[model samples]
Target: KQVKAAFEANKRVYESVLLTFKGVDGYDVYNCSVPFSYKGKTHIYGRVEKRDIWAASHVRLFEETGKDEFTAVPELSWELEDPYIAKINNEMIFGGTRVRILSYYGYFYRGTPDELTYFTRGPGCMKDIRVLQLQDGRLGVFSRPRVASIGFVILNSIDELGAEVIAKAPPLDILNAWGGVNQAYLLSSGKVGCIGHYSYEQSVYVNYAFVLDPQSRAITGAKIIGTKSCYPPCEPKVPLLADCVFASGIVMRSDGKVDLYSGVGDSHEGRITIDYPFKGHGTIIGDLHFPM
Candidate 1:
């Protein structure tokens, strides 16, 4: 309870907006990637599903039409959920969880967001597999082999992504509450800054941020960044699901603040402004712009 108590005490919320999707009116589009740039257009990738059920969801990209509003790219969609994005070696890396009657696993796709094809199918029953392209031309892999544990590994290339290779990475920790990385960035000091989510016994989910050393795999400054209160109160997917803040992405601001984007309550997305989650750790390296 110490961890949660500290989070409640220190968490601050500045401003927030619940995102709206135009085409997916009847379907809920939540658990999305951060806003990204693709050929000059800003877009977001998220899961779309019926309000009464959570299965057979579709993942798709929505072009930002206006502030907090987006239009679905009619031709761009996938049979997946909880989609994420990363840029490595000048290529677009898109990924999500595929759930079906017969097959359930995480997968990766390569090429531009407008045109993506499967590159690999990841370990079954696993999700939140995040990767960071390190400055040294290596890939820093983050995995959630089990709900309560996270793993870290470094590889020379994307071709080296294998089930056994990822399954064996050294462990990071949590408790009955599970946490995993959703997006990663390299800091000027070489540490990996992670934006992710932490879940309680069942439905309470909150955004979490932490800094990790690529060399030692030691994590620091882990804290709760946002909670359900950050967004306007709304009914969840189910009565039991009171909170679900799927921390998706962040943009570092020049004023030493950050805009945290997250999928909130399994129905809509929310963006929050707060003091930089990594204030004293290390500033993000590189352009810190969309599409890497």
Candidate 2:
């Protein structure tokens, strides 16, 4: 009765309804009115492709079009791994500069701004860090602190092995829980900025931020300007703003539009906030042209 009742209630209405979709931002257009089927079952096939987005890597159908036709971006090989995206002048650039080790067998890519430089520091330690700079004038890295240890490090160049220790807590007692590294920003005032959390029992949380000396590469002048002790951890999977550097704050998307959330704010005098929907994940930050 339940199945028949549900079918009878909406069979006619459902058959009469139609869905429409259109492509935008230079994606190829297609039309399909008939339902596709396989193995005696109905299915639908949809796809999108671009020849001039994100340096010709083609934005991967899955990445841009939300289709399963393409695979997720592959991990970088060799010294360059764990790549992130940055945009520069309407161009998408894939840049990764280093690698790291989690435990004896666990490994991950963590690079720096300086070319060919990579770093990492966990497994047993409190945190691991890496930094690198691209040839086209962009810089970044990755970091992960161990469980219970309440501390992190920041370095200047990829070549600079030692990072200035900013804040430290004694193991899991003072620092409750931690997550992935947030994007780092270099402000106009020659200071570096980063946002992440320190949690207690995974419910009680705190958001801490620091302003680093852009040139010194040391903690002698680092300042902790913002600290929110009580906060909600609603979106636990969301990536915090990471790639905020002194270079151009805007990144160009595949659609020829500028992204204003890639780097640090222009002036450190007032607060610089980012409004773009896709802010934290990796994005291209350079120029590329296809169909040549």
Candidate 3:
């Protein structure tokens, strides 16, 4: 079956979780936090979400007894800024430090090519994988002969495609909020994937599989692929939010297409092709954002 079917199969389950986080209740309390330093004086600051800014906080999803819960913790308290969140094998991974926010271009798995793994700053947050391009200047995940490898894809600017960059992300700042990695496809036969950050760790990771039609760049209708995990193997016990650092998972290709892998570092040996795109959902939130 196609990866799209996987997302559709459990759409309801994922939607229920998403609706809860969309709540904008204390919008007044929301503020974008930035990391600043002055002659050895360092601190974090936010100006509210309405002021065209972003903030970095550790979003926590935990399990108490058995029920799931969520919380957000600001990194400013520690004078830190801009967090990088990654989920590897259901484990949340943190990339930034008190000194600097790790500017992660994208995922760099076992079989990822050197070109695609170089590193980038323009790709922006990894909202989804369908259009995720590593900063290293390569395609997203592509196919290989022996094992599945990682590559890059072309995400046409919606501005040229008749869509507008409704929001211009400020030069990666510390105040930016984190959401972890996510994958989604555009309604216009395009796809996108992104990631967010938190206080440094203990956060949610997302992956929107694919988007189609006019919804590609709308940041709507993009199928949610990954999520924050909950279990003995997974990290946090609460709901999905920014802040988590290390979260590992996979996103299915456009049917029959396998991942590009070389198994350079880890002894996972050989080109690994993941047949199922939605494999680690049991631990992490499989579905991220919902319809536009």
Candidate 4:
């Protein structure tokens, strides 16, 4: 009933396409960033591995070969999982995870387009620690320290990111199962847009979108934006993960539609298009009104 109910709530599907990766044979690329422009070239960064939970993974960048296909750009020598990218004031924040199935941690780097310097690491034994540059020039950090939820914390600056700030951050009780925000961005509504994943009792993962009132930290316009069904057939490395769909990033196109990217079933990554998830709520990013 839960899975079906989720699908019932999600009826807006206009287009869906799977992203094909080249140059990595026998390995699949998953959990990726939406195509982002750095130094005049559009690129998508993702996690590549052998589809085994214990297999070592690497973060690889891909440039569009057009037609929903991407080719690997051989750069970066880090072995991490679930790579994400965030941009603010001409500075880029790149993050990834180094895991130990027993417990894991998040690592982040911030710098100009050409060089990134590691400056902070999240609390130990936790995952899904993300940060965003607020419109007021402050920093918004999202973390998961509890069950089925994510937390938000405002920092004076990115330099304030560390163990104490992350461990003490209060979680937003938005979902009922394992959940986390993969990517967040400034929205013109003076609100922040958060996109991520939440799962049901049976490991049924769904990509979700919502608007966050920066002042109150209350969630609004939350919806099951995409589910495993949004993509083609997939094989879960561990059968139980068959329903997984981890959202990586999103793009607000000029045509008013939104393109969402995600990793599916731990086997592959793909993209889906749907109507503006926050249509009546606010405008796209690129505004200066800070609601703090």
- Pairs that clash in candidate 1: none
Backbone clashes per model, in order?
0, 32, 108, 0
Residues 15-91, model 2: lDDT tens digits: 11112223334543111101212233322212223323211111111112222121222332232322233222233
Ranked candidates, highest TM-score first: 1, 4, 2, 3
**Tens-place lDDT digits, model 4, residues 1-292:** 4644757465677778788899778888888865677555567877888866555898887777776788887665557888887875657888888776576778888774346788888888777888788778788889887534688888898778887889888878586457888888787767888888877775877888888887888889887888878877777667888778999878777888988888988878878888877767677665211111
For model 3, the stretches where C-alpha displacement exceeds 4 angstroms are 1-188, 191-216, 222-292
Structural similarity to truth (TM-score) of each candidate: 0.94, 0.32, 0.26, 0.91
Find the candidate with the highest TM-score and give its number: 1
**Of the pair 1 and 2, which is ahead by lDDT?**
1
Q: What global local distance difference test value does model 2 have?
A: 0.27
Clashes of 1: 0
Worst 10 residues of 4 by lDDT: 283-292
Predicted candidate 3 versus true structure: per-residue lDDT over 128-199, tens digit per residue: 222222223222321111111122323342111111121122211111223323222111123333322222
**lDDT at residue 95 of model 3 (Cα atoms):** 24
The stretch of ten residues in a row with the least summed lDDT in candidate 3 is 261-270
**In model 4, which runs have C-alpha deviations exceeding 4 angstroms?**
1-10, 53-55, 100-102, 146-148, 287-292
Taken over the whole model, the C-alpha lDDT of each candidate is 0.81, 0.27, 0.24, 0.78
Off by over 4 Å in 1: 287-292
